[PDB]
Design a protein around this ligand. Structure first.
Ligand SMILES: [Cu+2]
Ligand SMILES: [Cu+2]
Ligand SMILES: [Zn+2]
Ligand SMILES: [Zn+2]
Lengths: 156, 156
């Protein structure tokens, strides 16, 4: 099996996210907690780069090795990195428990060394319309990057 | 080409280290700066894991995919992660400029997702003798881990 962990750092938001995967043929299990969030829904994605020399800016765009448009985790068309929204409760804490069929810790498309990023706003899952449509298909209109962390290899 | 960066964090020591590599057939070029160090020589290695949930402890041992004993960068027998000593000047700053033939950002033995660690003490390069010999061949007797950072993928 493989295991990875991202320690999310930000000015006011922080957290720890674990990814475990039994084998290259199994889904990634993504679990952890993020704190300091405003109550409500917050976009959550794997971005292309783990580079934090420019804070969360240097993370680049959503991880998208297959060249798709932005969607939610259940969408037929989505970026590999599209994990949808996490929900923070009244105390500002989001508990995260997800499985994903595109995110992997094995092979050429591994997310190891890349980043996890949580956003200030809610991800529209690529379903935005009108003047929001163009950006919806890139980023889901989730707004500013509140915290980020590098996906690090961990002992299995 | 490939590029990676490690932002080293610690209680008093910090730094940024870049790794660039033109192709899988080229040597890794390792360059950057570490500050807050005592003047003198400090051990510097790639460790197996990037996991920082337990500070630098969770980095595990020196990265050693080929199952060798510890040495210096010029040794015939060394761990992949063995980068020797860096030298901090009077102001506590070490300027780093190294090339390495074992460290790579390509293929199954990539260091992406692992960690760089700088130590409080000097690495004896595996040449320790007497009661120091056993540990010399594991860690070079470099002592405590002063700072660590995950090796993150960066835009080339
Ligand atoms: Cu994002
Ligand atoms: Cu070390
Ligand atoms: Zn996306
Ligand atoms: Zn070593």
């Amino acid at each position: 099996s493989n295991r990875a962990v991202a320690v999310l750092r930000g000015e006011t938001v922080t957290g720890t996210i674990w990814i475990t995967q039994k084998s290259e043929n199994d889904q990634a299990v993504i679990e952890g907690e993020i704190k300091g969030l405003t109550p409500g829904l917050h976009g959550f994605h794997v971005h292309q780069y783990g580079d934090s020399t420019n804070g969360c800016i240097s993370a680049g765009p959503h991880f998208n090795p297959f060249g798709k448009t932005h969607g939610g985790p259940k969408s037929e068309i989505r970026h590999v990195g599209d994990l949808g929204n996490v929900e923070a409760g009244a105390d500002g804490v989001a508990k995260i428990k997800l499985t994903d069929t595109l995110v992997t810790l094995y092979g050429p498309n591994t997310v190891v060394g890349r980043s996890m990023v949580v956003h200030a706003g809610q991800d529209d899952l690529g379903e935005g319309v009108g003047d929001k449509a163009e950006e919806s298909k890139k980023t889901g209109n989730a707004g500013a990057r509140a915290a980020c962390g590098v996906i690090a290899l961990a002992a299995p």
